[PDB]
Design a binder for this molecule. Structure first.
Ligand SMILES: OC[C@H]1O[C@H](O[C@H]2O[C@H](CO)[C@@H](O)[C@H](O)[C@H]2O)[C@H](O)[C@@H](O)[C@@H]1O
Ligand SMILES: OC[C@H]1O[C@H](O[C@H]2O[C@H](CO)[C@@H](O)[C@H](O)[C@H]2O)[C@H](O)[C@@H](O)[C@@H]1O
Lengths: 228, 214, 217, 210
């Protein structure tokens, strides 16, 4: 029943404000046993709790020292959500930001700081570069083993900023033997990845293959037919 | 084995100020004994009163106060009320453990005096058939609930055979009790007159039974 | 705030062992630990020890080291006190109690009675109680119903199958050679008896023996 | 909030193996000590709460214990889908996390090469992609040859996380040239070496013939 839905821009310019939102479904933001946390994950810092807000006959806020001075976490009882605001961001704040519920998990009736439900995470990049949507090219199967065996085909998603990009095949129909590679950062400063799948050669004549590419930052959506 | 001592019992009228004490056998009660107090009411209802020598728990009325008085901890009730009738226990902290005192039974007089009704029954036919005999002495409708029981056989005091229940509470809030004289069927027939004696607040109600009357 | 529910009464023979439980329900904003306390004869309170559900610390009264073992199940919010090698001196009411940051015992379980007895299940013999018929003269008369040599408690005693309720006094049981005896007495008008049927209905469920008995001079 | 040490910080272990991860906390507060399992591109999932209580929908093979300031997660019988990073926590502090890898039999890469698309080439760049699929272990190497000459740059590589079913890895290498430069050559090849291959596998295409 409990779900956490995160939203808000992933790309933030240096010295400006990071603004994220976490919308709660299946509990109240002001529930007596709900504690609303932001936690972030980066390679430098690993997993770092940033702060919380909870209701107990009046709203409380606690923040980690690392960020105490530029962080604000605010509930909205109207929309049933809570927000994160981090001020004056630097590249050190590039991370994946999660919201998380605590206080549902109790021992002897007391909150024990287990985080039982997490939102999906928003990837946050601190950079002054502009948003750029991918080009999507086909990686067509070769004539090799078309009569019988395994064909490899794929999509190449190039020159997009920032991360992330999602790729699926046949709108989810095809997942077995799919490999979507981690993006690389080109020297241009834009990202590129490949997504590839292995399929029976005999399906090449009968089944259609489409890579569905979503880049939310630029509102870019692309469906590319990949064919011999 | 530190021993904690409190006065055993105390009887007050409503409106009085009462002070209960709590003494450590090892020496002075001090701040670092962190005296606490609980109140046991009828039906085994415990609720906590004071902690940290003088810190009232939530909802505890301000008539209750904690203090160190000389070299013992004390609980003072300023204007005792009938609802404060209870057993009060202090516990002392000895570095790593709590030790409870024996409790002070506080009676607050909250109703008229009432003298015992004493009904004394004879041993029955059926019970006599089994070569045993029990005289039952019911004691009802008294207040306060403190009775001494005593038995007389042929006008002579009794020493054994006798059991007496603790005063318990009646529908009407007075106290009842019962005492038993368990005899043998031969000892019943060897004596003629039998008598139950109840003392209460200085007077004595008594009832007799003669075997010739059954 | 949390509420504490202890497990039901227990009847044991000497040498047996027993496991009392105390379930915390409800909520607490601060942590707290669980104390266990023994009441003997209804007035003598004794600290057995405590367990911390949060750091697992335990401390015992030296008198109860090796007799009592405290544990917790953190998933069910239940504390347990296990007593080894039960003796007559273990017959008592056992309480669990919350002690939180202020170090006063602010919540208590209602208590679990443990009775240690080697006595066997014996049904009661029910005897009538009627006055000496010389002393019939008086506007009210009081009858009764003696219940002797039963084990174990409880017994339930009524009058005229529960129809007659007022005038009645049922006294607490006494312990007489490892068996209990009771009595209950009724007051009715000198015209009501011996004219009407006055019958006591004694039940001893622990031997499935319910008994009726009417009273005459 | 200095990340707690976990020991080890990474391990690899065969399917069926008993595996133990130890969190070095500063305080014996078992009930405020928890573990999380994190699969790639997922939020951590609560695995163990209060040192030993299992989270919802966590198989019995996961168990937890503490002694002094050391808390341990044990996986009794390691399974392929247990590939993850494991994190302990106490209060507001997280451990550094422990990466668990599955050991399996050696499996050689299947190699595929993809010439650039005509679509891309109109745009002025050529990307050539080499795919090394479903291999183990992770040390597969790729050399790019153009007209049989080794390239020392112009390529970027990327590896998948260990598969949850078959515990294999996959790598793609991408060789990027200007269109002009692409057309000044004929034979494009990737040459793949890996422990599971007796000698190098080469796949190649002829520019134009593609
Ligand atoms: O010890 C008094 C405080 O208890 C709680 O706070 C602590 O424990 C919480 C969970 O049990 C943690 O989330 C918190 O960080 C601790 O400060 C309570 O929330 C506080 O109001 C009390 O001051
Ligand atoms: O990154 C430097 C340049 O790389 C490519 O071009 C070089 O490598 C080619 C492949 O071996 C040669 O044919 C070419 O002459 C080299 O300049 C890329 O195509 C260039 O655009 C880059 O500047």
């Amino acid at each position: 029943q409990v779900q956490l839905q995160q939203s808000g821009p992933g790309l933030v310019k240096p010295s400006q404000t990071l603004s994220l939102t976490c919308a709660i479904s299946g509990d109240s933001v002001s529930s007596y046993n709900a504690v609303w946390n932001w936690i972030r994950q980066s390679p430098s810092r690993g997993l770092e709790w940033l702060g919380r807000t909870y209701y107990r006959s009046g709203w409380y806020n606690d923040y980690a020292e690392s960020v105490k001075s530029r962080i604000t976490i605010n509930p909205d009882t109207s929309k049933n959500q809570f927000s994160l605001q981090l001020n004056s961001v630097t590249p050190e704040d590039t991370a994946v930001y999660y919201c998380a519920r605590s206080g549902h998990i109790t021992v002897f009736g007391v909150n024990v700081d287990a985080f039982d439900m997490w939102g999906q995470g928003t990837m946050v990049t601190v950079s002054s570069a502009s948003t750029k949507g991918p080009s999507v090219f086909p990686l067509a199967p070769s004539s090799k083993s078309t009569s019988g065996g395994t064909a490899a085909l794929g999509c190449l998603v190039k020159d997009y900023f920032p991360e992330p990009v999602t790729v699926s095949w046949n709108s989810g129909a095809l997942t077995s033997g799919v490999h979507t590679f981690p993006a690389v950062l080109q020297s241009s400063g834009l990202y590129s990845l490949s997504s590839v799948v292995t399929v029976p050669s005999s399906s090449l004549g009968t089944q259609t293959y489409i890579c569905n590419v979503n880049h939310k930052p630029s509102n870019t959506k692309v469906d590319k037919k990949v064919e011999p | 084995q530190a021993v904690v001592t409190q006065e055993s019992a105390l009887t007050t009228s409503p409106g009085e100020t009462v002070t209960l004490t709590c003494r450590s056998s090892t020496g002075a009660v001090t701040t670092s004994n962190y005296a606490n107090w609980v109140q046991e009411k009828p039906d085994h209802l415990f609720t906590g009163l004071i902690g940290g020598t003088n810190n009232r728990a939530p909802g505890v009325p301000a008539r209750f106060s904690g203090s160190l008085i000389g070299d013992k901890a004390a609980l003072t009730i300023t204007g005792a009320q009938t609802e404060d009738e209870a057993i009060y226990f202090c516990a002392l902290w000895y570095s790593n453990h709590w030790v409870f005192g024996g409790g002070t039974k506080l009676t607050v007089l909250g109703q008229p005096k009432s003298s015992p009704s004493v009904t004394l029954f004879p041993p029955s036919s059926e019970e006599l058939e089994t070569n045993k005999a029990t005289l039952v002495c019911t004691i009802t409708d008294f207040y306060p609930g403190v009775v001494t029981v005593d038995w007389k056989v042929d006008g002579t005091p009794v020493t054994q055979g006798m059991e007496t229940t603790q005063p318990s509470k009646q529908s009407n809030n007075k106290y009842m009790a019962s005492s038993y004289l368990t005899l043998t069927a031969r000892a019943w027939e060897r004596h003629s007159s039998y008598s139950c004696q109840v003392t209460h607040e200085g007077h004595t109600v008594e009832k007799s039974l003669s075997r010739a009357d059954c | 705030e949390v509420q504490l529910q202890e497990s039901g009464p227990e009847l044991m023979k000497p040498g047996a062992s027993v496991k009392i439980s105390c379930k915390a329900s409800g909520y607490s904003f601060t942590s707290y630990n669980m104390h266990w306390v023994k009441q003997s004869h209804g007035k003598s309170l004794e600290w057995i020890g405590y367990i911390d559900p949060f750091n697992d610390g335990t401390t015992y009264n030296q008198k109860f080291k090796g007799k009592a073992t405290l544990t917790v199940d953190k998933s069910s919010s239940t504390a347990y006190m296990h007593l080894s090698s039960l003796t007559s001196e273990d017959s008592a009411v056992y309480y669990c109690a919350k002690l939180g940051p202020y170090w006063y015992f602010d919540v208590w379980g209602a208590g679990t009675t443990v009775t240690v007895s080697s006595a066997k299940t014996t049904a009661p013999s029910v005897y009538p109680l009627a006055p000496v018929c010389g002393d019939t003269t008086g506007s009210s008369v009081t009858l009764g119903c003696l219940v002797k040599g039963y084990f174990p408690e409880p017994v339930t005693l009524t009058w005229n199958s529960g129809s007659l309720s007022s005038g009645v006094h049922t006294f607490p049981a006494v312990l007489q050679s490892d068996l209990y005896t009771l009595s209950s007495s009724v007051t009715v008008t000198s015209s009501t008896w011996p004219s009407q049927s006055i019958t006591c209905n004694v039940a001893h469920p622990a031997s499935s023996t319910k008994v009726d008995k009417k009273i005459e001079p | 909030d200095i990340q707690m040490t976990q020991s080890p910080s990474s391990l690899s272990a065969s399917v069926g193996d008993r595996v133990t991860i130890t969190c070095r906390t500063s305080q014996s507060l078992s009930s405020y000590t928890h573990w999380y399992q994190q699969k790639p591109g997922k939020a951590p999932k609560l695995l163990i709460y209060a040192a030993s209580s299992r989270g919802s929908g966590v198989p019995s093979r996961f168990s937890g214990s503490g002694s002094g300031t050391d808390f341990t997660l044990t996986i009794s019988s390691l399974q392929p889908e247990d590939f993850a990073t494991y994190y302990c926590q106490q209060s507001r502090t997280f451990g550094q996390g422990t990466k668990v890898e599955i050991k399996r039999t050696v499996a050689a890469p299947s190699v595929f090469i993809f010439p650039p698309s005509d679509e891309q080439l109109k745009s002025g760049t050529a990307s050539v992609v080499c795919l090394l699929n479903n291999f183990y272990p992770r040390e597969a190497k790729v050399q790019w040859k153009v007209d049989n000459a080794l390239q020392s740059g112009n390529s970027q590589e990327s590896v998948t996380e260990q598969d949850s079913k078959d515990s294999t890895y996959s790598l793609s290498s991408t060789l990027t040239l200007s269109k002009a430069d692409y057309e000044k050559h004929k034979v494009y090849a990737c040459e793949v070496t890996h422990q599971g291959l007796s000698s190098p596998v080469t796949k190649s295409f002829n520019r134009g013939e593609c």
